[PDB]
Structure formats: structure tokens, C-alpha cells
């Protein structure tokens, strides 16, 4: 309704990069969990971009 897609697009992108930096410093157990959340976050960002 408010059409502020860029504001939430940037918040999700900041969360994506935050999870990207935590991914390289992550143990093997939580690493698959982080990858599983990045694929979902890419879906959220792809929808907002479209």
C-alpha cells in the first residue's frame, strides 16, 4: 500500500549480508541452517525486486 519497496529491500539485503558474514565464520552444524535461510532470503528479495 505505501509503495516503499526500496526501504524493505535494503533491510533484507542488510540481513542477507549479515548472514553472509556469519556464514564464513560458522561451524558445520549451523552452516546448513544458514544456507537454508539464505535461499529463503533470496526468495524474499527477488519478490520485492520484482
Q: Enter the resolution in angstroms.
A: 3.9
Q: Is the dihedral of CA 14, 49, 36, 24 positive or negative?
A: negative
34 Cβ partners below 8 Å, 6+ apart? 19, 22, 23, 26
User: What's the length of the chain?
Assistant: 50
CB-side exposure of 34: number of CA atoms within 13 Å? Answer: 17
Amino acid at each position: 500500500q505505501t509503495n516503499q519497496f526500496s526501504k524493505y529491500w535494503k533491510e533484507v539485503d542488510m540481513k542477507i549480508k549479515g548472514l553472509l558474514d556469519k556464514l564464513n565464520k560458522s561451524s558445520d552444524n549451523v552452516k546448513k541452517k544458514i544456507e537454508a535461510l539464505l535461499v529463503e532470503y533470496l526468495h524474499f528479495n527477488n519478490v520485492i525486486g520484482q
